[PDB]
Amino acid sequence: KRLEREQKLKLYQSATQAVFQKRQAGELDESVLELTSQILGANPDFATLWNCRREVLQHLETEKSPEESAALVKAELGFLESCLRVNPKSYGTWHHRCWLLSRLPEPNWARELELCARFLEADERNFHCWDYRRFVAAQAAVAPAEELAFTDSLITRNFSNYSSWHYRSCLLPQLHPQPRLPENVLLKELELVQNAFFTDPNDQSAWFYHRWLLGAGSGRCELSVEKSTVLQSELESCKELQELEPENKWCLLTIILLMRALDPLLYEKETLQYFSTLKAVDPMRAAYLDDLRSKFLLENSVLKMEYA
Amino acid sequence: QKDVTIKSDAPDTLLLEKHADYIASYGSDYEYCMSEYLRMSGVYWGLTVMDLMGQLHRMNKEEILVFIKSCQHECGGVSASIGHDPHLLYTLSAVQILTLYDSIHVINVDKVVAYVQSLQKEDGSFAGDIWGEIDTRFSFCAVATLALLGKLDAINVEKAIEFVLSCMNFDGGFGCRPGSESHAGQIYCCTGFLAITSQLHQVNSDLLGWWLCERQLPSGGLNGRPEKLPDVCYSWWVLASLKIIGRLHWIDREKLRSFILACQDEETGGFADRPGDMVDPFHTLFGIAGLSLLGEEQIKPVSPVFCMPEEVLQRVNVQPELVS
Numbered sequence: 167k168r169l170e171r172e173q174k175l176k177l178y179q180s181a182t183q184a185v186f187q188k189r190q191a192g193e194l195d196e197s198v199l200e201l202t203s204q205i206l207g208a209n210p211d212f213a214t215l216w217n218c219r220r221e222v223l224q225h226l227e228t229e230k231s232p233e234e235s236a237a238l239v240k241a242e243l244g245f246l247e248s249c250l251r252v253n254p255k256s257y258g259t260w261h262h263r264c265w266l267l268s269r270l271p272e273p274n275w276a277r278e279l280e281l282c283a284r285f286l287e288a289d290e291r292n293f294h295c296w297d298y299r300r301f302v303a304a305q306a307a308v309a310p311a312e313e314l315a316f317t318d319s320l321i322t323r324n325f326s327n328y329s330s331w332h333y334r335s336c337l338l339p340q341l342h343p344q345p346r347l348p349e350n351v352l353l354k355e356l357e358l359v360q361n362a363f364f365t366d367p368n369d370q371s372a373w374f375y376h377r378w379l380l381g382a383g384s385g386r387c388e389l390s391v392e393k394s395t396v397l398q399s400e401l402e403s404c405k406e407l408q409e410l411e412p413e414n415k416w417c418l419l420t421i422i423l424l425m426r427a428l429d430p431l432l433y434e435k436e437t438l439q440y441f442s443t444l445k446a447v448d449p450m451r452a453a454y455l456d457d458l459r460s461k462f463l464l465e466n467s468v469l470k471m472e473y474a
Numbered sequence: 475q476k477d478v479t480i481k482s483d484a485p486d487t488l489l490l491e492k493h494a495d496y497i498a499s500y501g502s503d504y505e506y507c508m509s510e511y512l513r514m515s516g517v518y519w520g521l522t523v524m525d526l527m528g529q530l531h532r533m534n535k536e537e538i539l540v541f542i543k544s545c546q547h548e549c550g551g552v553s554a555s556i557g558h559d560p561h562l563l564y565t566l567s568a569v570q571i572l573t574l575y576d577s578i579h580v581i582n583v584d585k586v587v588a589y590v591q592s593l594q595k596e597d598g599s600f601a602g603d604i605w606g607e608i609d610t611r612f613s614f615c616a617v618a619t620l621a622l623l624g625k626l627d628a629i630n631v632e633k634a635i636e637f638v639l640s641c642m643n644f645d646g647g648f649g650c651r652p653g654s655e656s657h658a659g660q661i662y663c664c665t666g667f668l669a670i671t672s673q674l675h676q677v678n679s680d681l682l683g684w685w686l687c688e689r690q691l692p693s694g695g696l697n698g699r700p701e702k703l704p705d706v707c708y709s710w711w712v713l714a715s716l717k718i719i720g721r722l723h724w725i726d727r728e729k730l731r732s733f734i735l736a737c738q739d740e741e742t743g744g745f746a747d748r749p750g751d752m753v754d755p756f757h758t759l760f761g762i763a764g765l766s767l768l769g770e771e772q773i774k775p776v777s778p779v780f781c782m783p784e785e786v787l788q789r790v791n792v793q794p795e796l797v798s
């Protein structure tokens with residue numbers, strides 16, 4: 167076990183030696199692709215070897231036919247995919263694929279989107295894969311609306327949703343691109359997120375996204391009857407949840423935030439009560455919670471002073 | 475909910491003498507050889523942690539300076555090791571080392587500046603090297619390198635700022651590129667960037683500070699984003715970011731300190747990513763730097779921006795103002 171790796175090290179070492187010797191010699195050929203494939207599989211963070219692969223591929227396309235170059239590209243795609251199966255979290259491997267696809271005459275982007283869907287099935291939080299997907303969507307000029315459909319299916323089919331909610335925060339403003347969300351869109355998003363955190367009240371991602379939506383409107387002095395009514399309903403639903411899960415800190419914080427969104431001065435007493443409860447439930451955040459409360463009291467003093 | 479449970483026989487005292495022995499003897503091995511591709515940074519991590527512990531003299535100055543010079547390429551950029559390719563990551567590391575050693579003119583500074591300048595794109599971003607990978611990590615490497623050389627004016631700073639701010643997210647954090655999800659590592663790089671360029675007023679410190687303090691798990695350890703395991707190096711990323719934005723008090727210092735101490739190896743010395751795992755010099759730097767930020771008296775004060783001893787940065791007069 168701790169002997170063979172001395173021999174695996176021996177192979178890594180000589181292959182590495184070999185690649186560097188060939189590179190100094192100007193030997194940009196398939197033997198370097200052979201040697202590098204044997205090292206990059208286990209060791210994809212060895213950046214210089216990805217650079218060698220690119221140098222070889224660039225060189226070869228000068229002195230090979232369209233057909234032979236097309237074949238090298240397809241072999242590179244397979245190599246890349248085998249590497250990603252072993253380590254899907256290497257910056258180097260994902261950039262190489264991007265480099266490769268960005269220089270093809272007619273890249274197949276529908277196929278690349280499917281590769282993304284597959285890796286996101288394996289790990290819905292793989293940010294390299296989400297980043298690659300945004301790259302592919304841009305290159306193929308895929309519309310915000312389609313990517314929005316992709317996110318919905320992902321959020322409901324299971325948890326691990328922070329990455330999908332984040333993507334929604336970026337897509338929604340694009341579907342309504344001003345130089346803040348429209349209320350109709352905002353209300354639909356509140357319904358979706360509130361479903362999520364009443365389904366799984368321990369998923370922090372929905373609560374983080376809901377806090378964003380709470381700020382993304384038009385202000386408490388401008389509340390429509392519908393928005394007023396939706397927010398009050400959210401307040402009562404969170405209180406319900408608080409009964410069921412008295413240790414749930416996210417629902418207590420959200421109650422405070424909702425009262426703020428509704429009427430800071432009318433709910434001043436309950437707001438203070440909720441801060442005491444929350445600090446008892448989430449003591450590691452006591453300092454944050456005291457600072458937040460001091461901020462809210464200052465806001466309130468300014469509101470009381472605005473009086474006529 | 476995903477957390478580590480610290481077993482009750484985990485270390486609870488700072489084993490400094492052990493750590494300095496561990497680093498002093500590092501590279502005297504299987505893993506040493508396999509991380510050659512990051513050697514320059516490995517050297518930066520070992521020397522910095524040694525200097526924070528007052529043990530820098532036990533390292534080999536003369537030998538490192540010759541290594542660094544042999545790693546500067548004709549473009550001005552620096553590689554991780556001899557025969558490897560130049561990159562902003564290792565250019566930064568090299569410059570941090572020479573700053574620690576007051577030996578900046580060991581390399582051609584004019585060429586380093588030209589290398590960094592060459593990597594900025596029209597949108598203000600930086601590529602890591604000629605192969606074009608764009609990451610806000612590289613925006614930080616670029617301005618940090620230039621700040622240390624007194625040459626920040628060499629790049630387009632307003633465009634560089636514009637790009638970084640375009641990577642700000644709904645939750646107050648930052649990702650790799652525009653639209654990328656918030657991650658502690660990129661938050662550290664971007665808040666560092668904004669410190670260097672005097673733009674911290676553009677961060678929502680209360681919002682980002684809340685996201686950062688929610689990284690602390692019942693174990694006391696910090697993760698890098700929601701629903702991940704805690705890890706000593708995030709101690710550093712998250713804590714340093716909190717310090718830059720004036721919100722360090724938003725984490726439970728004593729619970730974090732116990733987590734970090736629990737990651738030490740009592741026999742071999744060094745820190746691992748989490749308690750009982752195998753140690754390395756990367757997590758040793760970040761564990762020690764984390765403790766220093768938390769106010770550990772046996773360790774020198776560390777810059778949250780440059781992750782180097784503050785007395786080094788005072789000496790070169792590059793100390794960006796933080797929020798509070």
Ligand SMILES: COc1ccc(S(=O)(=O)N2Cc3cc(-c4ccc(C=O)o4)ccc3N(Cc3cncn3C)C[C@H]2Cc2ccc(OC(=O)NCc3ccccc3)cc2)cc1
Nearest residue numbers: 211509512516563611614615705707747754755756780781
């Ligand atoms: C194990 O395979 C590997 C995978 C990735 C890398 S890495 O190189 O990409 N880098 C370092 C790293 C080094 C070691 C290691 C082994 C042995 C030694 C011995 O030397 O060191 C192990 C892990 C590890 N990880 C991976 C990890 C750790 N914990 C959970 N994970 C998943 C973190 C990663 C992140 C990172 C990325 C860029 C960066 O540069 C800057 O940001 N600079 C600006 C700056 C300036 C000043 C201060 C701070 C920052 C710094 C760190 C290396 C190996």
Ligand SMILES: [Ca+2]
Nearest residue numbers: 531532533534
């Ligand atoms: Ca010495």
Ligand SMILES: [Zn+2]
Nearest residue numbers: 705707708747
């Ligand atoms: Zn780590």
